[PDB]
Design an enzyme around this catalytic site. Structure first.
Site, mmCIF file in Angstrom:
data_model
loop_
_atom_site.group_PDB
_atom_site.id
_atom_site.type_symbol
_atom_site.label_atom_id
_atom_site.label_comp_id
_atom_site.label_asym_id
_atom_site.label_seq_id
_atom_site.Cartn_x
_atom_site.Cartn_y
_atom_site.Cartn_z
ATOM 1 N N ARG A 1 4.671 -8.827 -4.525
ATOM 2 C CA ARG A 1 5.557 -8.277 -4.761
ATOM 3 C C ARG A 1 7.237 -8.361 -4.145
ATOM 4 O O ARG A 1 7.079 -7.970 -2.503
ATOM 5 C CB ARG A 1 5.815 -6.704 -5.473
ATOM 6 N N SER B 1 5.202 -0.458 -9.795
ATOM 7 C CA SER B 1 4.355 0.313 -9.221
ATOM 8 C C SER B 1 4.894 0.919 -10.343
ATOM 9 O O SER B 1 5.769 1.646 -10.725
ATOM 10 C CB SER B 1 6.024 0.352 -8.144
ATOM 11 N N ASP C 1 -2.903 5.554 2.765
ATOM 12 C CA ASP C 1 -2.167 3.505 3.125
ATOM 13 C C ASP C 1 -1.792 4.063 3.331
ATOM 14 O O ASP C 1 -0.281 2.917 3.562
ATOM 15 C CB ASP C 1 -3.521 2.818 2.702
ATOM 16 N N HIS C 2 -0.722 4.654 2.388
ATOM 17 C CA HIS C 2 0.616 4.700 1.743
ATOM 18 C C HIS C 2 2.023 5.177 2.755
ATOM 19 O O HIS C 2 3.472 5.466 3.246
ATOM 20 C CB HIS C 2 1.255 4.728 0.889
ATOM 21 N N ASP D 1 -2.286 3.147 -8.552
ATOM 22 C CA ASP D 1 -1.676 2.299 -8.106
ATOM 23 C C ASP D 1 -1.824 0.497 -8.678
ATOM 24 O O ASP D 1 -2.861 0.796 -9.452
ATOM 25 C CB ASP D 1 -2.788 1.303 -7.050
ATOM 26 N N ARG E 1 3.767 4.938 -10.320
ATOM 27 C CA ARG E 1 4.924 6.102 -10.057
ATOM 28 C C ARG E 1 4.813 6.912 -10.901
ATOM 29 O O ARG E 1 5.840 6.386 -11.933
ATOM 30 C CB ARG E 1 6.039 5.480 -9.265
HETATM 31 S S1 SF4 Z 1 -0.213 -4.324 -2.896
HETATM 32 FE FE1 SF4 Z 1 -0.041 -2.292 -3.164
HETATM 33 S S2 SF4 Z 1 -1.893 -1.270 -2.139
HETATM 34 FE FE2 SF4 Z 1 -1.428 -3.009 -0.774
HETATM 35 S S3 SF4 Z 1 -0.966 -3.658 0.067
HETATM 36 FE FE3 SF4 Z 1 0.951 -3.504 -0.713
HETATM 37 S S4 SF4 Z 1 1.722 -1.207 -1.386
HETATM 38 FE FE4 SF4 Z 1 -0.114 -1.624 -0.540
#
Ligand code: SF4
Ligand SMILES: O=C(O)CC(CC(=O)O)C(=O)O
Length: 754
Positions: free
Chosen positions: A447, A642, A100-101, A165, A644
């Site tokens: 965020r 995050s 997904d990233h 994550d 990371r």
């Molecule tokens: S909160 Fe994190 S896992 Fe969810 S869409 Fe955003 S970047 Fe992706």
């Protein structure tokens, strides 16, 4: 067990163990002699030795056994490359990878994905064949965002899940304890060794009343985030309880837990109740709902359990909120944000409106947004702002497309993105603004720290619900208030927006979609994983240096960080995601966004021997090839954000030894310890003022490094004066061995052949 109900459809042979949960809860229960909270029940019910584990909230390190591991493709690469170095044959608990990233938002769904797959074929393919090889399930790119595929398929009441994550607390919406970790924690559970977690405190948020009108689940954590702030949840789990819980839907419950990652909570959880039962059955897990109904006393808090702090929120007085613009905790009623924007100097006309992501893309969510779209369209109105929709999964895209919501949202002018994070981690070729442009964007994400969405430092981003984002995207201004204000329709009449109405779950079942997952073949005894030796995308890890038995004298300070230093300042995202499996390539982004207290600027520190100011990565490398060991000095809640682990590997790679701060964020401090660095906090935060860029430090006492013993640091000032301060740490004897060996991984390997 006596029951024989599988964990999911993808692991039919792996059965839920609530008999074990219950045996360990009951063992624990009787040592403790007190009521347990729900998160105590699920956490302590997963101890590796419940009879001997020492349990003290905010004090002991619990030794746990997670049920399953979930990885996301921006952190799964380094996670699988370190696993590849353990030398282990196959993974030890159910594990999955989600892609997904690495898919960038540009034209829309179909197009952005064909380009992601062309562009990223090397990494996707390493992940897929490492999956086939070590037994990890693989969700193919475009299949969805990890927290949504998990809630829809892999989360259940009582699971203890770890994911690489930060937004992995999403799972708590289905009654599971889902904690976010760095990749080296994921290879411990995956290797079969117990995982450690500092015993959490429990913040209790009691929900009273019922949700109404424009108020959504999203609002409850926007209010709570404002009440506790970013610093508020560190070291605790937020457990939600009260009458009000049953007024929220399961995916709404998952929204709240999901955003609890922005107040620094270890995770968030809600008690098994009928809303979760319902969703379990509508997502094809009726049998999990039925098994869970017979173990229901283990999946609710005991009567009179004790929360170390209680926050009481009335859902019936609650009204819509928009948080920001540069932190998730500056809370505002939707009613006031117009005025604050003009008193404060915040761009009032809304540029891009973004709904979706894994925080707000349930069928319920998509439906309430459509129920607002349908009314604007019914007066020949359409989006005054640019509008994007991200489905969290192929199943949600397929089902909302089919029940018509997706077309409604195209008709007001929205563009549906690939089922990937996309603009939520900053993976977005944005074009309506010039860089440096001052503008306002409203999202339904979580965020909204700076430059997280487009990397335009001056973009003002507010987060709220998908329904308020649609309503404010048609309006095109933060001045608008859906609840109150009138809109002038094409026909010259005013009318106002009706508060949306929508099915929680489909009337029908859910369309799964085609071709989203690749099973591991227990077959391929000859599955081979190859990192092309000269790849710029992937690189095998090389063991870090073991500790020298000596103290760290005369360390050079590379940078003394003024203020907030998030993991996006240490290891930026955006364009560095391309090198997430290549350590010496992503290391060239070490601390470039942090602010140097010397000159108030980012990415210009003063090289100690050339006396010239220039980039932090370069200077660190300089020091490294000259034999200069260095330290980073920080302020509060360092490594905030995050997950990371690259924020800890990257200082290790360029010669860093220690990071001394006033306070660390949880996941970042486990990652520093896991990679053999020294996370240390001042025993007196006023001492951060005794240290200047020019001083050299000596950290003394490594020789008799003991849990609870603080370390003594001598400050050597240029004029020959020196000072001695004390520095604390949270290393237990398990983590001191990671230190000794040079990394946790080097240690892991000493337990085999050395
Ligand atoms: S909160 Fe994190 S896992 Fe969810 S869409 Fe955003 S970047 Fe992706
Ligand atoms: O200060 C600590 O020891 C760690 C923090 C965060 C955590 O690991 O839970 C705490 O205990 O508050």
């Amino acid at each position: 067990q006596r029951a024989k109900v599988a964990m999911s459809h993808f692991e039919p042979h792996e059965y839920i163990r609530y008999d074990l949960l219950e045996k360990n809860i009951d063992i624990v229960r009787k040592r403790l002699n007190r009521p347990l909270t729900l998160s105590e029940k699920i956490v302590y019910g997963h101890l590796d030795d419940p009879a001997n584990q020492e349990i003290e909230r905010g004090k002991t390190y619990l030794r746990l056994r997670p049920d399953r591991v979930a990885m996301q493709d921006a952190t799964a690469q380094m996670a699988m490359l370190q696993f590849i170095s353990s030398g282990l044959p196959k993974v030890a608990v159910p594990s999955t990878i989600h892609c997904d990233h690495l898919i960038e938002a540009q034209l829309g769904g179909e197009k952005d994905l064909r380009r992601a797959k062309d562009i990223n074929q090397e990494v996707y393919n390493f992940l897929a064949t490492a999956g086939a090889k070590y037994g990890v399930g693989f969700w193919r790119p475009g299949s969805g965002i990890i927290h949504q595929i998990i809630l829809e398929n892999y989360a259940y009441p009582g699971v203890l899940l770890i994911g690489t994550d930060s937004h992995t607390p999403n799972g708590g919406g289905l009654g599971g304890i889902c904690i976010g970790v760095g990749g080296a924690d994921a290879v411990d559970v995956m290797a079969g060794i117990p995982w450690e977690l500092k015993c959490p405190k429990v913040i209790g948020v009691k929900l009273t009343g019922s949700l109404s009108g424009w108020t959504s689940p999203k609002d409850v954590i926007l209010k709570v985030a404002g009440i506790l702030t970013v610093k508020g949840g560190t070291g605790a789990i937020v457990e939600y309880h009260g009458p009000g819980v049953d007024s929220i839907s399961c995916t709404g419950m998952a929204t709240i837990c999901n955003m609890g990652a922005e107040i620094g909570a270890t995770t968030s959880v809600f008690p098994y109740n009928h809303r979760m039962k319902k969703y379990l059955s509508k997502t094809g897990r009726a049998d999990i709902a039925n098994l869970a109904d017979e173990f229901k006393d283990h999946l609710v808090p005991d009567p009179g359990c004790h929360y170390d702090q209680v926050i009481e929120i009335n859902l019936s007085e609650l009204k819509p909120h928009i948080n920001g613009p540069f932190t998730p905790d500056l809370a505002h009623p939707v009613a006031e944000v117009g005025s604050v924007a003009e008193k404060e100097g915040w761009p009032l006309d809304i540029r891009v409106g973004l709904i979706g992501s894994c925080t707000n893309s349930s069928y319920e969510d998509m439906g309430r947004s459509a129920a607002v779209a349908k009314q604007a369209l019914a007066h020949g109105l359409k989006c005054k702002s640019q509008f994007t929709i991200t489905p969290g999964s192929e199943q949600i895209r397929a089902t909302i497309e089919r029940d018509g919501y997706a077309q409604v949202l195209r008709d007001v002018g929205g563009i549906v993105l690939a089922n990937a994070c996309g603009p939520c981690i900053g993976q977005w070729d944005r074009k309506d603004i010039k860089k440096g442009e001052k503008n306002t964007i409203v999202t339904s994400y979580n965020r909204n720290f700076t430059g997280r969405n487009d990397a335009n430092p001056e973009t003002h981003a507010f987060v709220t619900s998908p329904e308020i984002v649609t309503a404010l995207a048609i309006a095109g201004t933060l001045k608008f208030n859906p609840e109150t204000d009138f809109l002038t329709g094409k026909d010259g009449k005013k009318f106002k927006l009706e508060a949306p109405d929508a099915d929680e779950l489909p009337r029908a079942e859910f369309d799964p979609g085609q071709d989203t997952y690749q099973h591991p073949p227990k077959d391929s005894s000859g599955q081979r994983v190859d990192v092309s030796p000269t790849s710029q995308r992937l690189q095998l890890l090389e063991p870090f240096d073991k500790w020298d038995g000596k103290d760290l004298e005369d360390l050079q300070i590379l940078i003394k960080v003024k203020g907030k230093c998030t993991t996006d300042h240490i290891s930026a995202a955006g364009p560095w995601l391309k090198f997430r499996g290549h350590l010496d390539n992503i290391s060239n982004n070490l601390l470039i966004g942090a602010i140097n207290i010397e000159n108030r600027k980012a990415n210009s520190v003063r090289n100690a021997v050339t006396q010239e100011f220039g980039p932090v990565p370069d200077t660190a490398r300089y020091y490294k090839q000259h034999g200069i060991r260095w330290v980073v000095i920080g302020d509060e809640n360092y490594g905030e954000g995050s997950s990371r682990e690259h924020s800890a590997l990257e200082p290790r790679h360029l010669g860093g030894r220690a990071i001394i701060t006033k306070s660390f964020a949880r996941i970042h401090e486990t990652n520093l310890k896991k990679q053999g660095l020294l996370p240390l906090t001042f025993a007196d935060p006023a001492d951060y003022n005794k240290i200047h860029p020019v001083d050299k430090l000596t950290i003394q006492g490594l020789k008799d490094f003991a849990p609870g013993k603080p370390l003594k640091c001598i400050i050597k000032h240029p004029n020959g004066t020196q000072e001695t301060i004390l520095l604390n740490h949270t290393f237990n004897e398990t983590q001191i061995e990671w230190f000794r060996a040079g990394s946790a991984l080097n240690r892991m390997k000493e337990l085999q052949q050395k």
